[PDB]
Design an enzyme around this catalytic site. Sequence first.
Site, mmCIF file in Angstrom:
data_model
loop_
_atom_site.group_PDB
_atom_site.id
_atom_site.type_symbol
_atom_site.label_atom_id
_atom_site.label_comp_id
_atom_site.label_asym_id
_atom_site.label_seq_id
_atom_site.Cartn_x
_atom_site.Cartn_y
_atom_site.Cartn_z
ATOM 1 N N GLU B 32 25.032 55.111 16.044
ATOM 2 C CA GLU B 32 24.389 56.101 15.189
ATOM 3 C C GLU B 32 23.371 56.949 15.961
ATOM 4 O O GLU B 32 23.240 58.149 15.729
ATOM 5 C CB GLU B 32 23.720 55.420 13.998
ATOM 6 C CG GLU B 32 24.698 54.767 13.035
ATOM 7 C CD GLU B 32 25.192 53.416 13.498
ATOM 8 O OE1 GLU B 32 26.129 52.920 12.873
ATOM 9 O OE2 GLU B 32 24.672 52.838 14.477
ATOM 10 N N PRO B 212 40.174 53.986 36.688
ATOM 11 C CA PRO B 212 40.358 52.757 35.896
ATOM 12 C C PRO B 212 39.260 52.556 34.826
ATOM 13 O O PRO B 212 38.101 52.903 35.057
ATOM 14 C CB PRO B 212 40.276 51.640 36.943
ATOM 15 C CG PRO B 212 40.348 52.285 38.289
ATOM 16 C CD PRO B 212 40.105 53.744 38.144
ATOM 17 N N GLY B 249 30.442 56.079 35.934
ATOM 18 C CA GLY B 249 29.498 57.116 35.558
ATOM 19 C C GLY B 249 29.859 58.543 35.906
ATOM 20 O O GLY B 249 29.057 59.447 35.692
ATOM 21 N N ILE B 250 31.055 58.773 36.439
ATOM 22 C CA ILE B 250 31.413 60.151 36.770
ATOM 23 C C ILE B 250 32.631 60.725 36.071
ATOM 24 O O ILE B 250 32.850 61.932 36.134
ATOM 25 C CB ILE B 250 31.487 60.425 38.286
ATOM 26 C CG1 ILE B 250 32.248 59.328 39.009
ATOM 27 C CG2 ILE B 250 30.086 60.604 38.842
ATOM 28 C CD1 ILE B 250 32.725 59.742 40.319
ATOM 29 N N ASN B 274 37.424 57.343 24.915
ATOM 30 C CA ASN B 274 36.860 58.616 24.507
ATOM 31 C C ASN B 274 37.763 59.836 24.824
ATOM 32 O O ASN B 274 37.643 60.479 25.892
ATOM 33 C CB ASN B 274 35.450 58.769 25.084
ATOM 34 C CG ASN B 274 34.679 59.868 24.420
ATOM 35 O OD1 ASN B 274 35.245 60.895 24.067
ATOM 36 N ND2 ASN B 274 33.379 59.675 24.245
ATOM 37 N N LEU B 276 37.490 62.677 23.337
ATOM 38 C CA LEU B 276 36.797 63.947 23.170
ATOM 39 C C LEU B 276 36.408 64.612 24.495
ATOM 40 O O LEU B 276 36.525 65.835 24.634
ATOM 41 C CB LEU B 276 35.568 63.778 22.274
ATOM 42 C CG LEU B 276 34.861 65.096 21.943
ATOM 43 C CD1 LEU B 276 35.535 65.789 20.750
ATOM 44 C CD2 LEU B 276 33.333 64.913 21.675
ATOM 45 N N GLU B 277 35.988 63.804 25.466
ATOM 46 C CA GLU B 277 35.258 64.292 26.635
ATOM 47 C C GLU B 277 35.969 65.422 27.392
ATOM 48 O O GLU B 277 35.342 66.427 27.695
ATOM 49 C CB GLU B 277 34.884 63.137 27.589
ATOM 50 C CG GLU B 277 33.686 62.281 27.142
ATOM 51 C CD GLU B 277 33.444 61.025 28.038
ATOM 52 O OE1 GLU B 277 32.307 60.516 28.056
ATOM 53 O OE2 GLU B 277 34.378 60.551 28.735
HETATM 54 N N1 LIG Z 1 35.356 54.363 35.364
HETATM 55 C C1 LIG Z 1 34.788 54.837 34.259
HETATM 56 C C2 LIG Z 1 35.245 54.550 32.978
HETATM 57 C C3 LIG Z 1 34.559 55.120 31.911
HETATM 58 N N2 LIG Z 1 33.465 55.977 32.157
HETATM 59 C C4 LIG Z 1 32.713 56.594 30.991
HETATM 60 O O1 LIG Z 1 32.030 55.587 30.144
HETATM 61 C C5 LIG Z 1 32.083 55.976 28.714
HETATM 62 C C6 LIG Z 1 33.043 55.018 27.999
HETATM 63 O O2 LIG Z 1 33.080 55.313 26.627
HETATM 64 P P1 LIG Z 1 34.289 55.129 25.789
HETATM 65 O O3 LIG Z 1 34.554 53.688 25.504
HETATM 66 O O4 LIG Z 1 34.081 55.869 24.421
HETATM 67 O O5 LIG Z 1 35.483 55.705 26.516
HETATM 68 C C7 LIG Z 1 32.626 57.404 28.730
HETATM 69 O O6 LIG Z 1 31.504 58.298 28.837
HETATM 70 C C8 LIG Z 1 33.460 57.528 30.021
HETATM 71 O O7 LIG Z 1 33.249 58.816 30.627
HETATM 72 C C9 LIG Z 1 33.073 56.257 33.485
HETATM 73 O O8 LIG Z 1 32.137 57.003 33.739
HETATM 74 N N3 LIG Z 1 33.734 55.681 34.551
#
Ligand SMILES: Nc1ccn([C@@H]2O[C@H](COP(=O)(O)O)[C@@H](O)[C@H]2O)c(=O)n1
Lengths: 353, 353
Positions: B32, B212, B249-250, B274, B276-277
């Site tokens: 939320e 991954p 994180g990227i 996700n 949406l991204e």
């Molecule tokens: N290897 C990964 C896997 C997911 N991610 C991110 O972590 C978040 C995971 O959220 P979701 O479960 O909604 O997909 C998203 O922001 C996705 O961009 C990432 O930054 N690196």
Amino acid sequence: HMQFEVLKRFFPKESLKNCKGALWVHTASIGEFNTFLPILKELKREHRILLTYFSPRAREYLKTKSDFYDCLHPLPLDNPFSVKRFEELSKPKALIVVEREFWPSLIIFTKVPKILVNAYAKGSLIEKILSKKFDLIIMRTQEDVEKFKTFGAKRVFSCGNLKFICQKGKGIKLKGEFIVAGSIHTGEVEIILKAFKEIKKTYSSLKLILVPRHIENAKIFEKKARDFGFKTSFFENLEGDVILVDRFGILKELYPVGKIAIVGGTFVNIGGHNLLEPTCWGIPVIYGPYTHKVNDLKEFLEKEGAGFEVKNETELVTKLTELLSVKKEIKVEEKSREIKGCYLEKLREFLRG
Amino acid sequence: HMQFEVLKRFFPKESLKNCKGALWVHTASIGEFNTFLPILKELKREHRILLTYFSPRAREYLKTKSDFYDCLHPLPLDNPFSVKRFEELSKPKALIVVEREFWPSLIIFTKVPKILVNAYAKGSLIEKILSKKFDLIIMRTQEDVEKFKTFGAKRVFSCGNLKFICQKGKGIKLKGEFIVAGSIHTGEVEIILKAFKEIKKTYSSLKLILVPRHIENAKIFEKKARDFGFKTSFFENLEGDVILVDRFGILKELYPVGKIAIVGGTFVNIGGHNLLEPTCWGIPVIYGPYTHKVNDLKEFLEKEGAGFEVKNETELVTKLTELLSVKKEIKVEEKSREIKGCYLEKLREFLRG
Ligand SMILES: Nc1ccn([C@@H]2O[C@H](COP(=O)(O)O)[C@@H](O)[C@H]2O)c(=O)n1
Ligand SMILES: Nc1ccn([C@@H]2O[C@H](COP(=O)(O)O)[C@@H](O)[C@H]2O)c(=O)n1
């Protein structure tokens, strides 16, 4: 999509009337119900059960468990009138609260005798206040017991941790000599095959049963084991050096077949899966360093000489050979029967009158 | 190990008194808070913020978000006295409840003007009763607005779903032609590599960036890509035909670099990550058929022409080809600005007087 059952928490069902005089058991969520289940199973034989829960996630799960209770209702909202209407309808003989669930209005405003099971002390003010309102408190350690004594709780005992109770089920028998690796993750699979390969130089007849956390990865695990040079097979078929399991729901039945178990979720930063299952069959368990989600359990097993943390491939190799050449005695199951027995008897005695 | 903050929920902190006249925002938990963050960001500039939460899980997270609020306190327990002590001490000008949080003593016993945001209608009795006690309700769909209207709610509008607001960040830039495959699981890698291989026959310059779900799987993913005949490299280094990302994180920064995104957790029975991204960069997203955990988002993206479901490898090829040959216009970002603006202005309007 979930049922929050707000109206029912606020103004409990008139139908609780039909559950008059039941034993009231409150299990916050799925975890608490499963923790308590070996006790409920026995009490269910001597009491009508009124079962409550707090988490809306638990309703659906708990519907599948109607064998273990007579009535099912969400915990009333924590206000004196909601708590009191619940109590007034259901006229319960006692209320057993699993783990903690310090709901102040629940605790303060009900007359029902109250029992707390599997508690630990945190030393917080709310504990100083609510602990004394329980007629019986059963704690995890003697240390926790001392703390609640200094809170002026009368009737506080220690029975150990309910989460260490073995729920073995049936067990499978296979001709052969086996290690069982259960709940293995993709990131773990390499270290375990490199170690097993190292091991097999010495124990030629030894077969690894490899059970992925997610069965959708069985084929990838098998192929990995081919690339490392193993004969491979899919369970039923025991012909491989590495036997793969691609069915969910078999792993706990499968452990008793091995001399040693390895439990994954642990060599990668997952936090660990169920370390207890193999040890219930008298079999030692190895895991990697990432056990932060099963810490109490990890520490328990070390104290019991049943659990062994390894940092890497060498250490896993080292630890496997040690356990293959000297058979380790494990008495987890007997500790389990002792924890169960301690809880049941205190509760039966309390409920006697 | 978590703080449940029971004593504070029951008897709210005296120091709330130093928060007099704040705008009170209630976010049950992490979901939320993140949902509402883009409105909070703006409201923060015109108002002192008193932030409450219900889940004990939320506390730690929200402690790291002190830029977005002035006071932080757990939601009072749902009894008239706890609710009113909270109100009395903090003298809030309005309370904005994110999503639902149909807490009845909260709703019934506070005098503070109450605003409900991102709500939907479930058609239930507690809704008939409580919904009218809100001075302003802002719902997801006009259908939902309809239902609440017949509940005699005055001041009910539809602004869309707040969960479809884009929060893009910076956006990486790379020389090359790319597809981006994100949050891919082990059980999905094969079908993506098979499809990409079939695609590369026609588009020989295309590079696949493979991210991954879990970091620790990068090496197994890289080897898998080699088994398929691709040059491979690890990110920074763009030399491979398949480029692995082994840092967290990227992914969200990486999407704009591609012409198409594929988002996993969707080809295996996980229920989807996700979607949406990538669409926030104006880039179409493909996914497999398991989207049951991300279903509203899925339906949204389909409606928007930005999201395409594919059943298997053959359909993934067909769909990649379509989108590579004819560029698809995506207007999710523009929709996002419309949702954020509709909510922000309604809220500022009501708060003005
Ligand atoms: N290897 C990964 C896997 C997911 N991610 C991110 O972590 C978040 C995971 O959220 P979701 O479960 O909604 O997909 C998203 O922001 C996705 O961009 C990432 O930054 N690196
Ligand atoms: N492939 C798998 C993985 C786990 N399992 C079982 O499912 C349960 C997983 O629980 P835990 O998360 O506590 O490890 C355990 O009973 C474990 O034995 C299985 O039966 N097949």
